[PDB]
Amino acid sequence: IVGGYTCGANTVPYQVSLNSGYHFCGGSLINSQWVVSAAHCYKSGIQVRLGEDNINVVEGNEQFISASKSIVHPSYNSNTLNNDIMLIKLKSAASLNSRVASISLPTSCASAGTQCLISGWGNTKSSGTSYPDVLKCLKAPILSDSSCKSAYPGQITSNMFCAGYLEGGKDSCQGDSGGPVVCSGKLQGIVSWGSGCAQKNKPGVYTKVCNYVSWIKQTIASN
Ligand SMILES: NCCCc1ccccc1
Ligand SMILES: [Ca+2]
Hints:
Elements: E1 5-6, E2 15-19, E3 23-31, E4 34-37, E5 47-50, E6 63-72, E7 86-90, E8 115-120, E9 136-141, H1 145-151, E10 160-163, E11 180-183, E12 186-193, E13 204-208, H2 213-221
Antiparallel strand pairs: 1-9, 2-3, 2-5, 3-4, 4-7, 5-6, 6-7, 8-9, 8-11, 10-13, 11-12, 12-13
The structure holds 3-phenylpropylamine (PRA) and calcium ion.
């Protein structure tokens, strides 16, 4: 996250870190046994790390649970990033409390102008690199679909939205991938892609989760 603030330990209790020997992607807990992330975060051998603030320090609220199954969206296209969403089932159910808590799925798509919280452990610099060890947070509005299509000509599908600031300085970034965009207490987006980070007229692009709610519900009902 570029131009954000330190969230505070366990103040984003649905935030997960996907670890394969190192943090590589964020994610969101949607019930005690399922995580949703970006399909471009797909990998074999994922351990899901819950209750995290400092990812390099064991601080006492963590639950490390291995993944038993990953399901990438059946129409994921890695070239266009259309349908960049994946579900991960945990081997055992997480233990839920004020510090590890699931986030609700939306019943409605969020509108342009809605303020949201984006969070993750990704890079904090737009030019160059510095990875935080603690969770960073950013408040950003959902941008109108016309300004989103004007920033990314011929690349925005109906399964994507832009969020952020057309004049740059504040944005999600590498390592924030698969992490949450929560608006009014509902998961609305997944950190998906963008042209660099915090660049002028190149805002973050996010997978539009309200389009996927019935695929998520069906898939967790049968797996
Ligand atoms: N410009 C938006 C943030 C771009 C970023 C998100 C996810 C992965 C890599 C970069
Ligand atoms: Ca830790």
